[PDB]
Amino acid sequence: LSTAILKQKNRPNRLIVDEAINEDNSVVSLSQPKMDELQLFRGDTVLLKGKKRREAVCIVLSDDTCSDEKIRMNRVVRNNLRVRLGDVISIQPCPDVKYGKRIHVLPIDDTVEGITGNLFEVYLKPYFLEAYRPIRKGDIFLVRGGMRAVEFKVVETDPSPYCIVAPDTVIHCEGEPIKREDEEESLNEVGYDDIGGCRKQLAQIKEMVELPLRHPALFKEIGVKPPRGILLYGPPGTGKTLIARAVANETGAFFFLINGPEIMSKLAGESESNLRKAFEEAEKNAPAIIFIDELDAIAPKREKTHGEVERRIVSQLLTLMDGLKQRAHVIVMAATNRPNSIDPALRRFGRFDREVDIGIPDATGRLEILQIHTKNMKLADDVDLEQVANETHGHVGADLAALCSEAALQAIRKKMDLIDLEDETIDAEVMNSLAVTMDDFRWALSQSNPSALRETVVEVPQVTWEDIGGLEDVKRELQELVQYPVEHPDKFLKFGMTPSKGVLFYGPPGCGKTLLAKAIANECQANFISIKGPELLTMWFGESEANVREIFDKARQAAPCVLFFDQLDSIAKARGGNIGDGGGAADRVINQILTEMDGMSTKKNVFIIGATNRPDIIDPAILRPGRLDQLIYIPLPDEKSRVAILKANLRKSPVAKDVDLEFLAKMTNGFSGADLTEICQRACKLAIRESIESEIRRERERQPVPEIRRDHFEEAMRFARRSVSDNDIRKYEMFAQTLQQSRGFGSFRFPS
Amino acid sequence: DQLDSIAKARGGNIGDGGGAADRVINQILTEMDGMSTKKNVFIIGATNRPDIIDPAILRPGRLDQLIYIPLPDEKSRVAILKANLRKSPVAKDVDLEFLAKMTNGFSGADLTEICQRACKLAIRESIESEIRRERERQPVPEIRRDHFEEAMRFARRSVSDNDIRKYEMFAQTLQQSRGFGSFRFPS
Ligand SMILES: Nc1ncnc2c1ncn2[C@@H]1O[C@H](COP(=O)(O)OP(=O)(O)OP(=O)(O)O)[C@@H](O)[C@H]1O
Ligand SMILES: Nc1ncnc2c1ncn2[C@@H]1O[C@H](COP(=O)(O)OP(=O)(O)O)[C@@H](O)[C@H]1O
Ligand SMILES: [Mg+2]
């Protein structure tokens, strides 16, 4: 019942907006049973209320084709109401409307440029002649006529705001021309419906701000003071400032904007006086809303601040919020990236009473954000927004906006070829043909990366599941590790068990441990963070452990995310190794990771994968189920596997049919995966050597090798050698034996 | 959560960082039990390896109770399996009592792994089954016994017998110096 406030409810006044048939800018049509329900007569003047606090007046008529639940209204009033077809409006009778005494109108520049004749005679008088048009202060209405229609705005009325344009009502159009920029900016103002995925957060913010202002009698009856401070926190791009703008636009209360840095002043006492002036102005126009952005910069902790100016600024803000003189009807909103950096005294009651967490949207939230951002763009029928929403695993609202913008830019880049790119004008046909398609969104998805993880980005060599030869059972567990919890979450809820998200790769060098991680980076539908082992460690005392939390929090923020620790033995050690180990910092890095993988915090869809050459030196606590659940042995490839490895390496290469890969696999009894790749790499170099030597001969006489041949492999083999010795293998075969001999050595079967 | 990190033996590493690690132990020492009056603040810590713990931290008045949480016996292994599956629909025919007897050195985390792996095998069949239905059109209500059977063959005990003995050795030293074993007042 937290979002019981959002439910628009079923009301007679709420009318679905639909197109009009014969109505002009001052009349609307309704169904006769609806007038019988609302007790309206044909010809009554009415109030129509739109989003972002817009209002209109028209004349209500009867339409026999009108659905009872819909209202007919033309494009002019729809733009006046900031309402599109399918939305809802509120309708109520408009009494006591008097004939206008004087109305002031002004044209729109983009509709009037090139029109030099008398605007009044050509446009206004025929439009208003004997019509008695009801208009409001601020209406935007279109008048046809002459060479081009000229758009008009009402700026002043007598009386205000509602009048009937009678024949005697003097109409004048002299004044300063209106700028197109103001009209377009008003159109593109942000509303509540612009927010996406913050339904719970929007519920909370609405309860704090909108409800007390609209219905003070309720809080007076229950006899409590509603919360007067809201703190919005979360990762960047979640919509904190956007929610601020939406609240500012959709409230009939004074809004003041404060930016943490811009309040500062070198001269002593002027920043405190700036804060005092802002709060004095807000109290002057009470009720008022104050938004302080980047509150961390203005208001850090007083205890850990050496600057006197910063401490006194925090104290001044603290006193303004909850001093002796309680602020009457001022709601202070604040937004910050790091709520912990804020002075704890500010996070009290009476000062930012209810902190609101703007989080990363889920699959449904990102679909809503995509629909919001793509409404202004033209989409082909093939475009699927559900698929794109499902693909953007770690994306935040700003990331989704960047994705939409990148798809739009790619559409123009596709239309690049036709135009010369330097013509004075572009031909109208190619402009009309330009439209975004699904392939543009797919390209943007390939290019787009979450803003949170722009640091942990590495270019990967584009390895696909086919490029890995053998390891079929190792592969199958690897799709199922990531796909099952993300693609079928409901199944785990059904059977009631959490997924197992830990995997460790151990084996002899060069057998495919790193290559599998490259495959996961591309094929798996989840964010990928690649971590080298010693990259976390830092010479400072607390930095090495802090970097561990930063990496794990990035994965939690952008879940589902695969956290791959290459050479995990560098990070993870048996603990208690040497007296001098950088002061025990490596021993202390272990204890920080053990809490991140499995600690007193809720589990997220973070998949920790680690590859190590020597796995016996790993801390036993790391190998525990719940941290690294599965221990997969990546052994030296067998003759069946070696057959596939040769195919995978030479698939792109043109190789003669005379060569058989089966004989290659049979001869190499103990070669690793890298050894077989070096054999194929050596074959090209000899083929390269022969090919260039041939062309130089052919060029010399003036002044061949289409495919890799059998004698190249025979020549390349004699340089090849086995990378991993038997004594190295026995170490790895020994560790797997301990795991098998521990349990599962005897097949386990239930009794009949 | 990991008390051996913040509270380690002093003097083990000479020149450890700036010496800050040893001074933090001193700060914890005074805060837990010092000249100030003690409120109702209960300090609870967990550590994998308690041998590196500073003996001062272990002194009564600071973590006075040293609770040893050993590997579950057979009776606990039944409870651990039931506790994991209390919200999980399982077949009646599967007997959790047998599973406890087969596993001997399995941890509570290891037992959950068998149950979790059993769930993933069932989910694999359910996905494949619903794929087959789509092919013919154009399943697994509860966890079955064969799902646990295939899960167990991948299972393995995480704590080695050597890793156990480092804990019995620490536990025994407490009991070795605990006194004359059982204690009865004269008469
Ligand atoms: N199964 C395989 N299929 C295809 N290529 C393979 C396979 N195994 C190894 N390779 C080749 O081995 C090389 C590197 O292997 P990879 O990086 O996966 O090994 P690693 O054992 O994880 O690494 P390292 O031991 O060198 O730290 C690449 O040339 C890759 O093509
Ligand atoms: N929930 C959302 N719905 C619609 N658009 C969003 C949402 N969240 C973010 N955006 C888009 O991303 C941008 C977010 O930037 P903003 O939230 O102002 O940054 P910050 O959170 O650091 O103040 C906005 O310009 C908006 O267009
Ligand atoms: Mg490697």
Swiss-Prot record, chain A:
ATP 2 binds at G510, C511, G512, K513, T514, L515. One of its GO terms (molecular function) is RNA binding. This is Transitional endoplasmic reticulum ATPase. It comes from Homo sapiens (Human). The modification N6,N6,N6-trimethyllysine is found at K304. It catalyses: ATP + H2O = ADP + phosphate + H(+). The modification Phosphoserine is found at S2, S26, S451, S691, S747, S752. The modification Phosphothreonine is found at T425. Changing H172W: Severely reduced binding to DERL1. It is found in: Cytoplasm, Cytosol; Endoplasmic reticulum; Nucleus; Cytoplasm, Stress granule. The modification N6-acetyllysine is found at K491, K494, K657, K731.
